[PDB]
Design an enzyme around this catalytic site. Structure first.
Site, PDB file in Angstrom:
ATOM      1  N   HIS A 177      33.744  46.440  33.664  1.00  0.00           N
ATOM      2  CA  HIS A 177      33.510  45.581  34.845  1.00  0.00           C
ATOM      3  C   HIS A 177      32.699  44.310  34.465  1.00  0.00           C
ATOM      4  O   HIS A 177      33.061  43.178  34.803  1.00  0.00           O
ATOM      5  CB  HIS A 177      32.775  46.452  35.888  1.00  0.00           C
ATOM      6  CG  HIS A 177      32.510  45.706  37.196  1.00  0.00           C
ATOM      7  ND1 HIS A 177      33.227  45.843  38.285  1.00  0.00           N
ATOM      8  CD2 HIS A 177      31.515  44.791  37.435  1.00  0.00           C
ATOM      9  CE1 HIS A 177      32.725  45.048  39.185  1.00  0.00           C
ATOM     10  NE2 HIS A 177      31.708  44.425  38.670  1.00  0.00           N
ATOM     11  N   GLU A 178      31.568  44.489  33.803  1.00  0.00           N
ATOM     12  CA  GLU A 178      30.739  43.381  33.385  1.00  0.00           C
ATOM     13  C   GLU A 178      31.482  42.473  32.438  1.00  0.00           C
ATOM     14  O   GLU A 178      31.419  41.251  32.575  1.00  0.00           O
ATOM     15  CB  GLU A 178      29.466  43.896  32.695  1.00  0.00           C
ATOM     16  CG  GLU A 178      28.447  44.649  33.564  1.00  0.00           C
ATOM     17  CD  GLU A 178      28.413  44.208  35.040  1.00  0.00           C
ATOM     18  OE1 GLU A 178      28.116  43.059  35.362  1.00  0.00           O
ATOM     19  OE2 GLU A 178      28.698  45.047  35.887  1.00  0.00           O
ATOM     20  N   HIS A 187      33.740  40.143  34.212  1.00  0.00           N
ATOM     21  CA  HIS A 187      33.025  38.953  34.690  1.00  0.00           C
ATOM     22  C   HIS A 187      32.816  37.989  33.517  1.00  0.00           C
ATOM     23  O   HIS A 187      33.052  36.787  33.644  1.00  0.00           O
ATOM     24  CB  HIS A 187      31.615  39.317  35.282  1.00  0.00           C
ATOM     25  CG  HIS A 187      31.690  39.920  36.670  1.00  0.00           C
ATOM     26  ND1 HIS A 187      32.346  39.413  37.703  1.00  0.00           N
ATOM     27  CD2 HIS A 187      31.009  41.042  37.102  1.00  0.00           C
ATOM     28  CE1 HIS A 187      32.097  40.158  38.750  1.00  0.00           C
ATOM     29  NE2 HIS A 187      31.306  41.127  38.390  1.00  0.00           N
ATOM     30  N   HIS A 222      35.273  39.521  41.916  1.00  0.00           N
ATOM     31  CA  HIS A 222      35.438  40.823  42.556  1.00  0.00           C
ATOM     32  C   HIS A 222      36.749  40.988  43.288  1.00  0.00           C
ATOM     33  O   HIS A 222      37.351  40.041  43.843  1.00  0.00           O
ATOM     34  CB  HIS A 222      34.304  41.060  43.552  1.00  0.00           C
ATOM     35  CG  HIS A 222      33.031  41.441  42.793  1.00  0.00           C
ATOM     36  ND1 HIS A 222      31.796  41.243  43.214  1.00  0.00           N
ATOM     37  CD2 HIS A 222      32.971  42.191  41.632  1.00  0.00           C
ATOM     38  CE1 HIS A 222      30.989  41.843  42.363  1.00  0.00           C
ATOM     39  NE2 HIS A 222      31.702  42.405  41.424  1.00  0.00           N
TER      40      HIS A 222
HETATM   41  C1  LIG Z   1      30.670  47.896  39.740  1.00  0.00           C
HETATM   42  C2  LIG Z   1      29.497  48.376  38.856  1.00  0.00           C
HETATM   43  C3  LIG Z   1      30.030  48.737  37.456  1.00  0.00           C
HETATM   44  C4  LIG Z   1      28.432  47.304  38.597  1.00  0.00           C
HETATM   45  C5  LIG Z   1      27.950  46.288  39.661  1.00  0.00           C
HETATM   46  C6  LIG Z   1      27.429  45.118  38.820  1.00  0.00           C
HETATM   47  S1  LIG Z   1      27.676  43.552  39.548  1.00  0.00           S
HETATM   48  C7  LIG Z   1      26.170  42.906  40.166  1.00  0.00           C
HETATM   49  N1  LIG Z   1      28.126  42.709  38.272  1.00  0.00           N
HETATM   50  N2  LIG Z   1      28.961  43.323  40.476  1.00  0.00           N
HETATM   51  C8  LIG Z   1      26.893  46.962  40.531  1.00  0.00           C
HETATM   52  O1  LIG Z   1      25.748  47.143  40.115  1.00  0.00           O
HETATM   53  N3  LIG Z   1      27.257  47.401  41.734  1.00  0.00           N
HETATM   54  C9  LIG Z   1      26.311  48.081  42.609  1.00  0.00           C
HETATM   55  C10 LIG Z   1      26.456  47.536  44.043  1.00  0.00           C
HETATM   56  C11 LIG Z   1      25.625  48.290  45.031  1.00  0.00           C
HETATM   57  C12 LIG Z   1      25.977  49.471  45.719  1.00  0.00           C
HETATM   58  N4  LIG Z   1      24.996  49.868  46.565  1.00  0.00           N
HETATM   59  C13 LIG Z   1      23.986  48.971  46.461  1.00  0.00           C
HETATM   60  C14 LIG Z   1      22.745  48.917  47.118  1.00  0.00           C
HETATM   61  C15 LIG Z   1      21.873  47.861  46.822  1.00  0.00           C
HETATM   62  C16 LIG Z   1      22.231  46.877  45.882  1.00  0.00           C
HETATM   63  C17 LIG Z   1      23.461  46.927  45.221  1.00  0.00           C
HETATM   64  C18 LIG Z   1      24.343  47.972  45.510  1.00  0.00           C
HETATM   65  C19 LIG Z   1      24.943  51.107  47.381  1.00  0.00           C
HETATM   66  C20 LIG Z   1      24.794  52.379  46.512  1.00  0.00           C
HETATM   67  C21 LIG Z   1      23.866  52.106  45.320  1.00  0.00           C
HETATM   68  C22 LIG Z   1      24.084  53.069  44.173  1.00  0.00           C
HETATM   69  C23 LIG Z   1      24.148  52.365  42.812  1.00  0.00           C
HETATM   70  C24 LIG Z   1      25.565  51.825  42.454  1.00  0.00           C
HETATM   71  N5  LIG Z   1      25.495  50.360  42.454  1.00  0.00           N
HETATM   72  C25 LIG Z   1      26.559  49.581  42.577  1.00  0.00           C
HETATM   73  O2  LIG Z   1      27.698  50.041  42.658  1.00  0.00           O
HETATM   74 ZN   LIG Z   2      30.688  42.791  39.622  1.00  0.00          ZN
END
Ligand SMILES: CC(C)C[C@H](CS(C)(=N)=N)C(=O)N[C@H]1Cc2cn(c3ccccc23)CCCCCCNC1=O
Ligand SMILES: [Zn+2]
Ligand SMILES: [Ca+2]
Ligand SMILES: [Ca+2]
Ligand SMILES: [Zn+2]
Length: 167
Positions: free
Chosen positions: A120-121, A124, A130
């Site tokens: 995923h990273e 980007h 997205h």
């Molecule tokens: C797609 C991944 C490989 C990476 C992405 C990285 S990004 C930045 N490059 N788009 C990511 O960190 N997504 C968060 C997004 C996210 C989900 N929630 C969040 C609650 C608060 C803040 C962020 C999030 C709710 C549940 C939180 C549980 C942790 C899981 N976190 C996520 O899925």
């Molecule tokens: Zn992302």
């Protein structure tokens, strides 16, 4: 899929990358293998090629970090943002950072699957934005499908090939 505004992209034939720091959760050899695997997942669909360097500057600088780490996007501790990457460009552009407060795993344990997060990273880092498709690797949240059994979706492939053409 969606690309970045003004669709930045790497113009060179080969793009370098370098792992500047490692996680305490995995062996260094595993991170290296998984990063190559992740880059190859996208590289297989396009004309680019990647080369790892161990010193100096590389187009894609990769590293783990907890909290504030220089770039003005401090990490937030365990959970929530797992990692973040930047659109292709010089300096911070194209880099990818992983939140060291997460419990990174190769898949054989509970935690965040590093191969999936790196795909995923690095998506980007290559210019992918997205997706709205819950099944795509570029969907914004982690966990929809199976972190241990996945591949790029047709949406992710359509996007990367629109940006760099097919191989
Ligand atoms: C797609 C991944 C490989 C990476 C992405 C990285 S990004 C930045 N490059 N788009 C990511 O960190 N997504 C968060 C997004 C996210 C989900 N929630 C969040 C609650 C608060 C803040 C962020 C999030 C709710 C549940 C939180 C549980 C942790 C899981 N976190 C996520 O899925
Ligand atoms: Zn992302
Ligand atoms: Ca860079
Ligand atoms: Ca976090
Ligand atoms: Zn950062």
């Amino acid at each position: 899929y969606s690309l970045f505004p003004n669709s930045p992209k790497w113009t060179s034939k080969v793009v370098t990358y370098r792992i500047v720091s490692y996680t305490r959760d995995l062996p260094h050899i595993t991170v290296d293998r998984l990063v190559s695997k992740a880059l190859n997942m996208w590289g297989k669909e396009i004309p680019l090629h990647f080369r790892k360097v161990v010193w100096g500057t590389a187009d894609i600088m990769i590293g783990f970090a907890r909290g504030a780490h220089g770039d003005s996007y401090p990490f937030d501790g365990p959970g929530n943002t797992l990692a973040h990457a930047f659109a292709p460009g010089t300096g911070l552009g194209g880099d990818a950072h992983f939140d060291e407060d997460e419990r990174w795993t190769d898949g054989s344990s509970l935690g965040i699957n590093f191969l999936y997060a790196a795909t995923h990273e690095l998506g980007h880092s290559l210019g992918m934005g997205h997706s709205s498709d819950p099944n795509a690797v570029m969907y914004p949240t982690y966990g929809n499908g199976d972190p241990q059994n996945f591949k790029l979706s047709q949406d992710d492939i359509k996007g990367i090939q629109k940006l760099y053409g097919k191989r």
